[PDB]
Design a protein around this nucleic acid. Structure first.
Lengths: 234, 138
RNA sequence: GCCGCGGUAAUACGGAGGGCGCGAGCGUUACCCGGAUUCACUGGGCGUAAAGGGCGUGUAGGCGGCCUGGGGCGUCCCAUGUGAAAGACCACGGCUCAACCGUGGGGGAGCGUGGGAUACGCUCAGGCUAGACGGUGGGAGAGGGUGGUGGAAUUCCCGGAGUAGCG
RNA sequence: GGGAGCAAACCGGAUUAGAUACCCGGGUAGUCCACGCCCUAAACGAUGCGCGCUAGGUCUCUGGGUCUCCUGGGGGCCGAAGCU
């Protein structure tokens, strides 16, 4: 139910690409690759989810971040599969610290939104038309996820945190609990609750993003069926 | 060859604390144990224990640290902010009871060898005795 | 006083009106300490700011791993002698106050004599092996000295061939 | 003592207003050997010596191992904490 799933194809990751502070969380260096202790991870998801659950059942929102290529789509789903916000594309700058001002991009998105098959396109030259269509396009592209939240989250969940170092800063400056799934690659030091394991194989990525939202819904009421994973496992 | 054991001991502590080292060893000496005995009692360490590395006696020192904090840099504050050798081997220092210091206004401590074993600012002061000021701890 | 002011509109010069400070005084000059952690014990430094000796070898000196006792010089504590008066410090009075002036109290580091403590330092005696040196066996190296030797090229001479230039 | 090559000085030709230079043709000490002096230097890592302690990554020289590697000594690069 826990490690039995994970022992399939979901444990250990990087090799001498690492960081020494990830020390307690490791079992062996077989194959010259660093293999992480799951027995320790067990005890971690426990204490991690204790906080996650707590935050869920009190109706406190969570922002999901995953820009890396072998994990983007896996985010778009779980997040919308829990009506919560995400960032699939570029982790923009000042999303949290200058929220005030990034927020005023949504107060342009919805301004364009109220115009997609509407009486004002009658007016305005063909110049603005396709232009604004092409604006909304990317406007939408980046702020699909980021939008559902219109006031600073109580926490953030993330995949490769070294890969989104920018994000971890913004949050941590605002005292916003940081929680994430990280590995040898990255350092535990600066994550308030950590899911230590493989941040690259969609396998290990998905499994962790699955039982993540599941516990969001169960603490909220009424767990459903699982969502897409085996897109093409080869 | 190490010119002063003590000053290195303290340093190794100062050095181990800086990285948040769970424990840290230090070669043994009865006078050191006496020191460390006060360090634990005064609440600067969990404690210590005699140990062995290749036949050679050490003292594993179990360090105590603060609680984890929020904001950027969560690194827990320290139990031992600052630890510094006083009577060094070149410049020895001695004091009668009346001449003893009040470390940090009393929050910290001054340790010292006297004819009656290793004591502290308050103890010695109270005993009514003096000796070689060893070091200051806070 | 230092930064600086004055070249036709000067709050910086000179006068004036006003204003700030102190007041039987107020200014200047000289000199001492201070600010100056600017000779740094308390309390500074030397990669590029001023500061690592061109580099070794070692004398005097400074400093000294772990453990056990003997001594008790350093060191600490106790008593006691000394530490004059005037001064300073605290009280209290005498001049109407004050400045001066008295009375009494409280001590002083130092050094002398006695007793005491032994952790640190020192000192004597013993022991250990983590410092240091030695042993055996191997290894890499344009480390140094002497002696001997190889070829490539520059230059010059002698011989051959060859001609109007070479550089 | 040696002296082929190179070359301060020195001389010629150039260039230039000038050219005691830069470029060209020569050229003396010196450069080399021995022996004895001299004692300086951007004698520079511009970082005195010895010791203990405080993440690792990367490539390299040299040793030792019941040699995918582990260990010791040395030479570079990137960098934790910290210092500046």
């Amino acid at each position: 139910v826990k490690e039995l799933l994970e022992a399939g194809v979901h444990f250990g990751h990087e090799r001498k690409r690492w960081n020494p502070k990830f020390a307690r969380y490791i079992y062996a260096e077989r194959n010259g690759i660093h293999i992480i202790d799951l027995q320790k991870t067990m005890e971690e998801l426990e204490r991690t989810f204790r906080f996650i659950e707590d935050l869920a059942m009190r109706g406190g929102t969570i922002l999901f971040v995953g820009t890396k290529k072998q994990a983007q789509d896996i985010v778009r789903m779980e997040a919308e599969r829990a009506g919560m916000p995400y960032v699939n594309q570029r982790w923009l700058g000042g999303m949290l610290t200058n929220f005030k001002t990034i927020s005023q991009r949504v107060h342009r998105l919805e301004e364009l939104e109220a115009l997609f098959a509407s009486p004002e396109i009658e007016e305005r030259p063909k110049k603005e038309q396709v232009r604004l269509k092409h604006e909304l396009e990317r406007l939408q592209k980046y702020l699909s996820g980021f939008r559902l939240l219109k006031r600073l989250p109580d926490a953030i969940f993330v995949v490769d945190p070294t890969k989104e170092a920018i994000a971890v800063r913004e949050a941590r400056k605002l005292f916003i609990p940081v929680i994430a799934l990280a590995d040898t690659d990255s350092d535990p030091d600066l994550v308030d609750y950590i899911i230590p394991g493989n941040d690259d194989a969609i396998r290990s990525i998905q499994l962790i993003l699955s039982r993540a939202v599941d516990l969001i819904i169960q603490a909220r009421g009424g767990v459903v069926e699982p969502s897409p994973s085996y897109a093409l496992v080869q | 060859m190490l010119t002063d054991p003590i000053a290195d001991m303290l340093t190794r502590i100062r050095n181990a604390t800086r990285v948040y080292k769970e424990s840290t060893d230090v070669p043994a000496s009865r006078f050191k144990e006496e020191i460390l005995r006060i360090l634990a009692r005064e609440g600067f360490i969990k404690g210590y224990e005699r140990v062995d590395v290749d036949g050679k006696p050490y003292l594993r020192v179990y360090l105590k640290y603060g609680p984890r904090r929020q904001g950027p840099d969560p690194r827990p504050e320290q139990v031992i902010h600052h630890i510094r050798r006083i009577s060094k081997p070149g410049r020895r220092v001695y004091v009668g009871v009346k001449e003893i210091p009040r470390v940090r206004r009393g929050l910290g401590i001054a340790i010292l060898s006297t004819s009656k074993g290793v004591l502290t600012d308050r103890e010695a002061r109270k005993l009514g005795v003096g000796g070689e000021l060893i070091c200051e701890v806070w």
